[PDB]
Design brief:
The structure is a homodimer of 428-residue chains. Chain A is of the alpha+beta class. Chain A folds into 2 domains: 205 residues, PmbA/TldD fold, CATH 3.30.2290; 222 residues, no CATH class. Helix content of chain A is 22%, strand content 39%. In chain A, the strands form 4 sheets. In chain A, strands 3-2-1-4-5-6 form a 6-stranded antiparallel β-sheet. In chain A, strands 10-9-8-13-19-18 form a 6-stranded mixed β-sheet, covered by helices on one side. In chain A, strands 7-14-15-16-20 form a 5-stranded mixed beta barrel. In chain A, a hairpin with a 2-residue loop joins strand 1 and strand 2. The radius of gyration of chain A is 24 Å and the shape is globular. At the A-B interface, strand 2, strand 3 and helix 3 of A face strand 2, strand 3 and helix 3 of B. Strand 2 of chain A pairs parallel with strand 3 of chain B, so a sheet runs across the interface. Chains A, B: This is PmbA-related protein. Chains A, B: GO terms for molecular function: metallopeptidase activity. Chains A, B: It holds the Pfam family PmbA_TldD_3rd. Chains A, B: Belongs to the peptidase U62 family.
Chain lengths: 428, 428
C-alpha cells in the first residue's frame, strides 16, 4: 500500500496540474530508565508519519497523516491548503553518499539483554562507597526508515539505527556532587555498561572537596563534554535563513576571521557514532561535507532550497524540518591530549559540564551566561573541583580565543568535539 | 479493523490466561499562526495511536503502535515486556457522566473561514493607531476520539472537539507595551475574533505610561487571567503520587485549613468551555466531581488506580498519562464584580499577567518568583500601569490570604477561576 498510495497520489497530481511530494518516516524505539536502581519506566513503540505536499505555481499545501488510507482525500486536503497564502521540489537523478547508518544489531537483542545492560551500568555506578545514589540510568535504541519521493523523479530511502546508554551518580560531600557519562553507539558492542557506570561515579567523586574561586578572568580548558553542549548555540548562527532574517551575529562575515586560526568546524554527513548521519536532507538533497570554519575563516552558511535559490548558491543539503541544521557539526581536533592541554595551560580552570543552555545561551547575540562544573589547575595538574561557578561570554569571542585544540574527540547528538584551551573566559 | 484487531487480541488474552487492555487515540488538528499579519505557519494533521497492555499476576507489558496490523505480534511484544519491572486494570460495569464534549461545528468550517477568523482578529488588534504591531495571532481547532477497552468488561468511548483563538499586540510607548487575549470554545460561534483582537490591543494600550512603584508588601487584586496561570502550580501538589513521594507541600494536611474560608476549589468533569472535559480518565475510570478545598479545608487528594489501592480509597478518576491531574480545576466564584473588588481593595496593585512559571514556580515548596504585568490602584480606581513588576510568595500562603473572590470566571486549559483579592503579597 505505500507504493499504491504513492501511485494514486502521483496520478492525482498529474490530473490536477500540480507536483506532489511524499515523505515517509517509520520508527521503532525501545527505552528504559532506572531510578535509583529500580526499573521505573520504559517505552516500546512503533510510529509512522506520512507528509503529503502539493506544489502549484511555487505555492505549497501540506497534509500529515499517520494512516495510509484515502489518498484522494489526503490529496484534496493538501490541495485545499494551497490557499493558506517561491517554493520548489528537488529533482531525481543526483548521487548520494553511501554510508553504513543501519547495522541491525540492536534489533537482535532481547529485552532481558537491554535490561541487563542498564543494570550493569547501575551496578558499576553504585559500587564505590562514596556514591550515595544513582538517580538515573537510561537506555535507548531506535530504528528509523525515511523515504522521500516526488513527481520530479526524486526517490530516496535511508535506514538508520543506534542506541545510547547514560548513567548519573551522586557522591557524598558537604554539598552533594553529581557526575554523569553517556556513550552513543551504532551497535550494542560499542556500549560498555561497566565503563559508563564507572565514569559517572568517577565524575561525581572527583568533585568531592570542591571549593569556589574568586570571580575573575581565567584561562579555561573546556573539556569535550562541555563544548559539545556549548557548540549547539552555533547552529542557529550558521542558518542562511536566520542570517537573511537578521537573527544571526554572523551576517556580513563570510570570508572573515570569526575564529582563531586553530579552529576548523565542518559539517559532516556521517560519523559512525553520529546517529543523525544521513545521506539526504528532508528536501531530498544530498548531504555534503564542507568547512563552516576553515582555520577560523567563515566559508559558508548552511542552506535549504529556498535560501540557496534566493542567494544564488548550490543547495548544501541542510534543509531539515524545523530549521536549517548541520548533520554532524564537528570541531576538528589538533594533536594534544587532555593531559598535554592541562600541562600547556598550567594554571586555570577546567570546565567539564555546562547547564542551562535554554535560558542561558543567546544565539542571536552570541551571549551566554551558564552554570558550570569544573576544577582548578595549578602546575599542570588538577588541584580541586570548583563549586558554584558561572561562566559567561560571547560564543564568537570564545571561538577567537581557542588557542589549542585536543585530540580527545567525543560525539554527541548533532555535535562532535575534542577539548579546547580558551585563552581567557569570564568566571563568576 | 479496530473491532477485528480487538477481537483477535482478546482471543489471544483468553488463550493465554492473561488480561489485555487496548487504548485507542485518534486526533485531527488544524492550526495557523500569523506573524505580524502574515500567515507564516500552519499545521493540518491526523494522528493515531494504539496501546496494547497485557496484565499477568499484577505485572503489565505494554506495546504502542500507530498501525492496526499484526495483533498476534503486538500481543507477543507486550507479553515479552512483562519482564521489565501490584497492578490492576479497571473493571467493567460502572456508570459514566453523560456530557456534551463533541459538537462537530469546527469541522464544518472551510480553511478560508478559519483563515478569515485569524485575519479578523489581526485587523481588529491593528486598528488603533497606538498599536505598533500585532506579533502573533494563533488559531487552533482539534477533534479527539478515545476508546479504552479490556477483557475485564471495560469498553468506553468519547469524542471531544473545540478551538482557540489568541492575539498579542504591542502598543507604542517609551518602552513598548505588550498585551494579549484568548478565548477557548467548543464551537466557533463562541469565538469572537473582533473582540479578541480589540481586547489584545486594549490590554497593550492600557499600559502606556506605566510607572515604577517602590518594592514592598501590597494588597493584590489578582485578575482571573493571572490566577488561571498561577493555579497550575497547585496541580502537582494535589496528586496523591507526588504526596507519597514527598514532592508536595500538602503531605499530612488532609482536613486542615490550607486556604481562606472564602476559597473552595473543585475538580469538575465538565465545563462547556473546558476543552479537557471528559467522562473517563486514561485508566477508564469515571471522572468525578468533588471539592479539593471546601471553605479552605483540604478534603482529598487526586488518585490513579495505583495510589487509590495503596491508600485504600476509591479511585477518583484522575489517572491521566503524564501524571494525576484534575479535569477542570475550578476556584468557585463569590459575589463581587472586578469593579467591586477594586473598590474594596481601595489601594494596592492589580496583577493581570504572570510570566515565567516554568522556572519561577516551585510546586514542591510552593514558592514562586514571577515576572508580572499590572496596575496601581488608588481610591478604588486604576491609575497607571506598573512597570517591571515581579511578584513573589508561597502559593499556599496566597490561598490563605484570599479574602474576597469575584464572579468574573474565565476558563483556561485545565483551570477555571475568577479574579481574587489577596490581603498582602510581596511586589518588587
Amino acid at each position: 500500500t505505500f507504493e499504491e498510495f504513492k501511485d494514486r497520489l502521483f496520478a492525482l497530481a498529474k490530473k490536477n496540474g500540480v507536483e506532489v511530494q511524499i515523505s515517509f518516516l517509520e520508527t521503532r524505539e525501545f527505552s528504559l530508565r532506572l531510578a535509583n536502581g529500580d526499573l521505573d519506566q520504559y517505552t516500546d513503540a512503533g510510529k509512522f508519519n506520512v507528509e503529503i505536499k502539493v506544489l502549484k505555481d511555487g505555492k505549497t499545501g501540506t497534509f500529515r497523516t499517520q494512516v495510509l488510507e484515502n489518498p484522494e482525500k489526503c490529496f484534496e486536503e493538501a490541495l485545499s491548503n494551497l490557499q493558506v497564502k517561491k517554493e520548489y521540489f528537488f529533482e531525481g537523478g543526483k548521487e548520494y553518499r553511501e554510508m553504513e547508518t543501519y547495522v541491525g544489531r540492536f534489533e537482535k537483542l532481547s529485552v532481558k539483554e537491554k535490561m541487563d545492560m542498564a543494570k550493569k551500568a547501575h551496578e558499576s555506578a553504585a559500587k564505590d562507597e562514596r556514591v550515595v545514589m544513582v538517580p538515573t540510568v537510561m537506555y535507548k535504541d531506535m530504528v528509523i526508515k525515511k523515504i522521500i519521493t516526488n513527481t520530479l523523479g526524486l526517490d530516496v530511502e535511508s535506514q538508520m539505527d543506534g542506541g545510547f546508554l547514560f548513567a548519573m551518580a551522586i557522591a557524598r560531600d558537604a554539598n552533594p556532587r553529581s557526575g554523569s557519562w553517556y556513550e552513543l553507539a551504532r551497535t550494542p558492542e560499542d556500549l560498555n555498561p561497566e565503563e559508563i557506570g564507572k565514569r559517572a561515579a568517577e565524575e561525581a567523586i572527583s568533585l568531592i572537596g570542591s571549593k569556589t574561586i574568586p570571580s575573575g578572568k581565567y584561562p579555561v580548558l573546556m573539556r569535550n563534554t562541555a563544548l559539545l553542549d556549548l557548540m549547539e548555540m552555533f547552529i542557529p548562527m550558521i542558518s542562511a535563513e536566520n542570517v537573511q532574517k537578521n537573527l544571526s551575529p554572523l551576517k556580513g562575515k563570510l570570508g572573515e576571521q570569526v575564529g582563531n586560526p586553530a579552529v576548523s568546524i565542518k559539517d559532516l554527513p556521517y560519523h559512525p557514532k553520529g546517529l543523525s548521519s544521513t545521506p539526504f536532507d528532508d528536501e531530498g538533497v544530498p548531504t555534503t561535507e564542507k568547512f563552516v570554519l576553515e582555520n577560523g575563516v567563515l566559508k559558508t552558511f548552511l542552506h535549504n532550497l529556498k535560501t540557496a535559490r534566493k542567494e544564488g548558491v548550490e543547495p548544501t543539503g541542510n534543509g531539515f524540518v524545523g530549521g536549517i541544521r548541520p548533520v554532524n557539526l564537528m570541531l576538528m581536533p589538533g594533536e594534544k591530549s587532555f593531559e598535554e592541554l592541562l600541562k600547556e595551560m598550567d594554571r586555570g580552570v577546567v570546565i567539564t559540564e555546562v547547564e542551562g543552555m535554554h535560558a542561558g545561551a543567546n544565539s542571536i547575540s552570541g551571549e551566554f551566561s551558564l552554570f558550570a562544573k569544573g576544577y582548578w589547575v595549578e602546575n599542570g595538574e588538577i588541584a580541586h573541583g570548583v563549586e558554584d561557578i558561572t561562566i559567561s561570554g560571547n560564543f564568537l569571542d570564545l571561538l577567537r580565543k581557542i588557542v589549542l585544540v585536543g585530540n580527545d574527540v567525543k560525539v554527541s547528538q548533532h555535535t562532535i568535539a575534542p577539548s579546547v584551551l580558551v585563552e581567557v573566559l569570564d568566571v563568576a
